[model samples]
Every structure is written in structure tokens, then in C-alpha cells.
Target: HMGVDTLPPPNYTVGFKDLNESLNALEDQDLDALMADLVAEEAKAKADKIKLALEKLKEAKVKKLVVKVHMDDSSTKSLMVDERQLARDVLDNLFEKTHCDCNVDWCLYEIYPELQIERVFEDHENVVEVLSDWTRDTENKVLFLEKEERYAVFKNPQNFYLNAKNKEYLLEESFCGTSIIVPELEGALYLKEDGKKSWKRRYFLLRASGIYYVPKGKTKTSRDLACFIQFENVNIYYGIQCKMKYKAPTDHCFVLKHPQIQKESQYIKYLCCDDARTLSQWVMGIRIAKYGKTLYDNYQRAVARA
Candidate 1:
């Protein structure tokens, strides 16, 4: 989404600040030969830094470390996980550290006083393809491209607030299905064409168990607009980070840029209201009696047979 061609270039250009001087000196030499020498020197310097850091860590009696292994998504090496122990436990106890789950197939090895890669799992088939596909149409970039049309209606503060409130209430209600109902008050508040009024008048079922939010522009496809809210266990530090990172204002705006939110919300309403089948199914799955009981637990039991 950020449109970055590659991971930010490595930030380790400590000694190579003035390329002008180096280039001037090498002007008389063959360009290719000069470039090769510079690369070799850079590699050697990096190796030295790593070695020094490792030594310092060892000297401090630090046994636990975190290492990030960047690999192709389709790689089958499995990161040498021993099944006898949970992945998290093994990393912590044996390696004396913990690991963070970077959505990218990279593992960040954390060691005290210094962080470094324990190993590089590389040379897998289609690594480039997988990475390219995964990063190509990220949510942010997609939303940016279509922001104007998708979010035209939601631009109004009243509409935005209404949608946000409705979404929150719908999720909180735990109703018959994962759909929002249009309240009578909002019935005449049409934000789009086709006489569509009411924020909660539609329902949207979740495709996955994650966070959902509205997006910015006119939605062309279902996946283009809707956002997912992800829940994480307290033990998952990395998950916490992911959620926190997106909780920022900028991230929230990016989320609203997608077009899927409105479409999915409408679809959810259709399923819950017109079909009735989905509502019944949702009720059955939750072992609830009636949708009304969703507001209160006691009412839920009284209508158990309903």
C-alpha cells in the first residue's frame, strides 16, 4: 500500500556517506570494478559489526536472543520448529527469547543489548512472486486509488458518526446474525441512490473473525471496502502491536478508504432482513432462542424454545 518498491533499504550506511569522493577517485578505474570493490568492502564492514554485537551479547551472559528469518511465503522448511514444545515456548526457553510474528515471512530475533538475524532462510521458489502478490494490492494503496467515489456519502460527519455508531452497536448486540438493523429514526436518511436510507437498515456478515470498519470511497468490489477487526489473545505480544499500530488516526483513515465496508454492510442487511434464513442459522449456531433476547440475558432464557 505504501508503494515502496522494496523494504526500506538497509539503514546501515555508516561509512559510505560521501559517495562523491569515492566516485571521483574511481573515475579513472573501470566502473564495474570500482562498484565491485565498494560492495565487497560494505559486506565486510557489516560482517564485522554483526560479529562485534554477537561478542558483546555473549560477554554480557545473554543466552536468549530473537532472530528474524525472512523467507518466501511458500517455503516449506517450517523454521525448524520442534513439535514437542509450543513454538512460543521453544523460542523463549531454548533460545532464551521470544519471537514476533511479522506478517511477512520474516522472523525478528530479539537478543538483549542487540538484535540480529540468527539465520537467513533463503532461495525458495517463487519467493519474489509471493511477496509481489501479497504486497501489490495492499488495503491502503487500493483505498487511496478509489477514495473519492467510495467515501462520497460518508464524508458527512453525521453520516460518518451514524455509521460508526451503528457498526459498534451491531457488533455489541450479538443479535441473531452479524448484521445491523436500520433503526426507524434513520430510515429516511438516504446516503446513496436506490432510496437506501438508515445506517443499520442493512446487514453484513463477517467473512473472517477480524475487525471490520467502513472505508473511504465508492466500493467497486466486496473486498475493496470492508475492514476486518482482529482479536488477539493477551499472550500474543505481536498481535497487540498489530492492533495498536492500526489504532492510530492515520491507520483508521486508511481503513475508511476501502469500499467493501458499505457493500458488505448492505449485504449483511439483505441476508438478515429479506432472506430470514441467515438470521435463523445464526441464532441456531449461538444456541439462542430469539433475536430480541440479545438485549438481555434473562429474556434470552425465557424464549429459549422460540
Candidate 2:
């Protein structure tokens, strides 16, 4: 959404800044023949560089394809991509093309137009493999965009804290061998029934390990809570237009499931929030709890790159 093309010019400096007096004198000479030969030699060098680069790319099993990137204003840009390139590689190329400030929140999102759902691609994800999952006739698109919620948790840790009682630590205190300390999250969310359209509102509690929900006629306490799902094998997705698709209570919905589950299945855990802010809080909070310190480190690296 940031228009940077006309604002910032390319940082490239033209020509040599300091030339030797000997070369400066040569610049005044009738050196047309010499200049032509030098131009031809540079052309040969450029050709060899391209030849070798293409060979190396081919050796690495890189496939060339044109990916149509959808913009927010209904316009699209087609970018040539190497199949072996990661999502970060594509984002870098996009930044160069768009001439925008490299904001850390900019992400390449895979949009499912028909299913009315979307998810942000990870930095290390293979672009081709992600696109390969789409059905041949499907209208799924990849969006070039930015969303503050992508890394907002690192900026303000308090936004993820659902309860005000546990505010002593900002990020984490205890360091377990497997993960860093995660925030304690507990709140109410509507969970859709498995293999059914009916939805039930439940009080959910989030810990460093997994998600627990209070069962019917039960109190919101540790011992009385039941295990709903763990963060080990699940990834979260944002739901769009779910009121018509799933008959959801509100459109601010999110889903949890394994990365390999592409289609609708009973294994998918669908949950709805009261509003957009709550949806972002729950999603980003789970991401922090899942990745812990690694997530923060990734944000730091992104900030440095930007």
C-alpha cells in the first residue's frame, strides 16, 4: 500500500567517482575503436555470466515460471520466478520491483478465492510447492501485501495478554530446553463442531504446550479444562467470508490444522473470535507460543534487513 516508486530514487551511483589522471587524459583521445572493442569484451563477459548462472540454476533443479501477483487495488503484476527460490526470495524480488520500503511486515499471502480463506507463506517455504497444491482449475492467487499483525506481537507484548493478572513478564521468564517462556492466554472463543455445522462457545486457555477448552458444565480452571489441540503439528489460517462458507457466527475466524491438510477434513479445528483485534491477538499469540524465541529472532532479522 506504500507508494515508493516516485519517492525514492535508486541508490546506484553512476560512473567512476575517481579516475586516474592517465585515464582522464585517455578520455579526451580519439579512442572510438578502443571503446568499441571494450564494449564487445564487456558483452562477452555479460554473456558468460548469464550462461554460468543459468547452468548453476539448472543444476539445482530450478524451474522458470511466471507468477501472477495480485495487488490490493485489483491490479496484478507478473513476475518471473525460479521454482527453487524461497518465499523470502520472491519477497526480495517484489521489493525491488515495487520500489517500496522493505517493511518487515510485507508478506506473500496465498489466497484461496473459492474457499474464502488465506494464509501467509513462511520465509523458508518453497514457492513452487506451495502453488502446486492448488487445483488446476482453482482461482487461488498469491498476494503481494503487508499486514501489521504479521509481526505485531514482538512490538507490543501486552496486546497478546488476554488476562491482566499475568503481566509480570513481557516475553518469557523460564527457559525450557525445548522452548522459551510463552504468554498465558485464556478467553472465550466459538469452536465449530467436527463434521457438523453447529458451533459452540467455549472458554479456552492457552499455555506454552497446547490449547485447552473448558467443557460443558465445567469451570475455567486448569484441572477442569480438556485438551483441544497441541501446537506441535498444527498451523493457523485466517478465515475470510466464513459466514457464508461455514455459517460462522462472525467472519473473524481462524483455523488450526497440520500443514499437509489442504482440503476440508474432520481434523481441521475451526474457531471464531468476537472481532478482528481478538482474532489477531489469538493468532499472533499462538504463533509466539509455538515458535517462541525463534519467532522473535526472525522478526529481529527482518527488521535488520528492512
Candidate 3:
């Protein structure tokens, strides 16, 4: 029994060579390479099948229905109302959506608000031209033309009121290309600064859009696009409020209030008619299910004869 127990001192190295040999074989065989090749081939086959299915799906015919919604100021407040909703409702419901929100008002303060009624193609053309001109001006130092006096005032902290005045000057310069020594713009900035001397140049960009307001009946055609540029950390935002009028079931006006800064690349390359349709389709597709009918149905009806 003792001899049996002590036999071979437990030959622990028996499987060691076998394990190492297995690992070495695995390393030499390039299992990862083989597996990767197999996976890639399988993926390609699956992708091809999926692509064919998508093509067939695109060719499938379906019915189209049209739903028109009129938007007023009230409709702008709905949580369900998004950018797509605004576009769709405007196209379908007309101005009824705007009447759903009572807290909002719209006014035509743009340089050319009447152009909104033009065809979408024409609208795209106008925007492309305007944006192109604006981009050129900005690049050529024509749009945000900075005055030496205003720049000096902006750099100083003690002359807070002067800084405010300079802001108005900049705004005037941006708009009518005139120099106006308006104190309100400067004074407001000074108050907002709260005597903080560390404040540097408060850069603001003046943009022209529609306006919507309440609590004051000063002018039916008040300034529509008043934007304030403020910096937070490394990011900048343009505080914007745009109002516009839509004549439909809703008599009330609507305001699109949000800060929109200049995009990095301002070239209007995708503003062509063909590109616009593609963009419209993409936008329409996302909200198609919300209209209580299939997207194909709507498309067919829209393209159908009366």
C-alpha cells in the first residue's frame, strides 16, 4: 500500500507538454485570421441579401393619403410638435397648428417675409442666395465690420456703459449698415455685467428674422430678430427669437425662439432642387408614422391627380 501511494511521485508534468503543443499548434494555425476571413465572407453575404431586400422594399407600391393641419401660435407649444411636425403641419394642416398655442405671437420683421408664400423651390433658391451672400460678406469682413472705437470700448471694464453703447453700434452696423450711438443696448449689457471688470469683449451678432411678443403694444412691426451672443466655457450661443405670420385656420401668429449660431461651413452646396427633395423625403419619413397612415400612401396622394 505505501509503495502504491508513493508510486511515480504524481507525474504532474504529463499534460504540460501536451498543453504547450496544443498552444503552439494554435499559434501556428492563425485561427484569428481564419475566423476573421470566415466572418467577413458571411457578413458580406448577409449584407448583399439585406441590400436586395431594401431595393425590393423601395419598389413596393402603396396608397397615399393627405392630412392638412392648420397651425397657430398654440400649436408651437405642444411637446409632440417638433421641427418635423412644424414642417408637416404647415404643409398639411396649414395654420391651424399655430392656433393651438395662445402664449405665442408672430410678426413679419424679416427683410422679406412676403417671400415665404413662394414655392418651396423658389424659397430654397432665395435662401441659397442670401446665405451665399452672407457667407461671402462674413469671409470678406463686410458683415461683422468692427469699428475701432467700439472695439476699444468693448475691451475696457470701467467703461461698462460705453461697452453697452458699442453693442448697439455693432447691431446698427450689422442691420442698416449705419452707425447709431444707442445707449440702451450698452446699458443693458452693463447691468448684466453687474460691475464685473473681468468681462472682456461681449461679442454679439445681429440677425434679421420674424418677431413675436406680448405685454407691449408699441409697434405691430417691432424688431423681429434680436440676437445676443454670449460665451459659456468654450461654447457660444446666439439667443434668437423669430416670429412669423401664417394665414390659415389660426389667426394667431407663431414664434420660433431658439439660438442658432453660424455653422462652421456656410457653403450652400446642398440647396439644389434635387437635394432639397431628398432632404424633404428624409425629414418626412421620420414622422410619417405619426400621421396615422403609411408614408407611401401620403406620397402617392401628394403626386396623384385631382
Candidate 4:
């Protein structure tokens, strides 16, 4: 018997329609920049008109780029993606081309060769926008592999609640059929100081909106909790050999910073856990606290695809 055809007809048509639209919009933006910066010897009104025209031109501008995605088997595939394409789009394309049984663990990861750090791209993230942050001569690459930790929290929501003081009550009361109620997590963690190799241990708490830490000599009350960092506009990256590089107490280190900030700077926040287990709990807990229901939906979609 012939194998069942999984690719639907409508899905195929939609993919082509999008690909054609993206290709048609693929034009030049560098020339537009050149013309805009020429310092035209014309009237101020004329300059305004040119500005309007350039803005309109940018609206329809989609630049094509070649993104090399490395596979788990030491093979690589070059994908022609438009600037506006999201990481999800690229993942689907890879699935279709490779004809691999899609698994939810399959993720598009970014590897910073210089920093020895890697992070999974969120489904909503724009791949081209992220690649733009890399330096012209940088050796960063996109990877396709199975990262279990990326969606581990969805599989076991109860594990993350172990750190909370009221874990027993919360676990039974919060968990429902689909949506999970995340409990607050408070415990001791190491925070690396800015522009230095020293780290200070602090009592940190996780909330739905952001993370807060207890001030020195202060009670772990809600009012006394100082904001450590917010979930918005930041991403978490797993550190490799951070102990040697930053003199951290352990190698279980993670950094949080804006996606645009590619290089090391004062803006990057380095945090450490005592061991690998705690690190996993903290990272997974943070993901749940940050993404909430949206993360669960992503997990479900991944499962369906798989």
C-alpha cells in the first residue's frame, strides 16, 4: 500500500502563495538608503515628498537572505528566507524539504560561536531580524536539533512548583486540564555584578510579571522585594563553561538580555544556580512565569505537529 499523504492540499497552496508574495516583494533597500543620504540640493518640501516615497518603498521591501541551518547529523541546509519570515516559517520549510517526522522538540537554535552560547528561537521570533544583530564577520549559525529542555516545563508543571513555599496547596489547586496556574517561586540565587567577575547571593522570587529579590536584612515580604528584572524584552541563554569565564561558583549559569544586544556588556545579567537540577527548575520556572498560557499553546502545537 502507498504511504498516507500527510501534506494537505490547502497547506501546500498557502505555502506557495506566501512564497510568491515574499519573492515578488524582494527588492533593494540599500539603494534607497543611498538615495536618501545623497544630500539633495532641493527644496525642503521636495525632501519631505522623497521621505514619504521612501517610507512607502520600505513597506513593500522584503530582502532575501541565505541562512545556513546545521542539522544534528553534522549536515547543513541553506534556506532562502525573506527578512520578514519568522523562525516558525523556516522550521516548517525545513520540515517539508527534509521530510522528517516533525517533533515538537525540533527547534531552530542560534549558536554564538564567539561566546560559546546557544538559545532556542521562540516561535514568534523573526529569524532575519535576529541575524541582523550579528557582526558582518561573525561566525554565528542557526541549528536544527531536539532540545528537550525547551518545552520540559509543559510536560511537568509540578516540578517547578517545588521551590514555592506553598507548593502542596498550589499544586492541587492550580493545575487544570490545559491552562496551568503557575505558583510563586522564591529561593536563593547568585547574581553577577555588573562589569565585574564577582557574584552575590540573593533571595529571589518569581512572579507572573517579573522577578524580584529580597533586599539585604529585609524580610521576604511583597513590599520589600526589589525588582531584579522583568520578563519583557529579554531572552534567556544557557551558558557554556561560564565558571572559567566569569568566575561563577558553578558552571550552571544563564544570562538574560535583549535579543538585539549580541556582544557582552553591562546590560547583560548573569545569574547562577548551585547545581544543574536547580538551574533546570529555575530556567523552566522562569519560562512558565514569563510565557504563561501562550507557552502551553506552543507546546500543544508542537505536539500536534510531531
Score each candidate by Cα lDDT: 0.24, 0.66, 0.22, 0.68
Off by over 4 Å in 2: 1-65, 80-84, 162-178, 215-220, 223-225
Give the Å shift of residue 65 in candidate 4: 2.0
User: Which lDDT tens digits does candidate 3 get at residues 1-306?
Assistant: 011111113211111143223222222123233233333399965754454343223312321111111122222111111212323232333223333221111111122121121011110112122223222113211011112221222233223222577665543342223332222221001101222212222222111111112213444325532323211101111111111111122211111111122232211001111232222222222122122122223333332311
Off by over 4 Å in 4: 1-60, 163-180
Model 3, 300: alpha-carbon shift in Å?
32
Question: lDDT ranking from best to worst?
Answer: 4, 2, 1, 3
Candidate 1: global Cα-lDDT? 0.24
Residue 213 of model 2, lDDT score: 69
Q: Is candidate 2 or candidate 3 better by lDDT?
A: 2
Residue lDDT tens for model 1, 3-121: 11111134111112332222222222233332333333998557544543433333122112111222234211112122132222322322222233311222222111111101111
Q: Model 4: which residue pairs collide?
A: none
Quote the lDDT for 145 in model 1: 10
TM-score of each: 0.16, 0.69, 0.15, 0.73
**Using TM-score as the measure, what is the rank order of every candidate, best first?**
4, 2, 1, 3
Among the numbered candidates, top lDDT falls to 4
lDDT value, residue 124 of candidate 3: 10
Question: For model 2, how does the per-residue alpha-carbon lDDT over 1-306 read when each residue is reduced to its tens digit?
Answer: 111121113301011122222122222121232233333399965754454343323322334444667777787665545567778888887787678889888888886665566888767667877776565455677898888788876666666643343333454442224556565677888888877887888888777767876667565474766677778767778877777777889999998866555566767788999888778878887877776776766676678869
Top candidate by TM-score: 4
Stretch of 10 with least lDDT, candidate 1 = 233-242
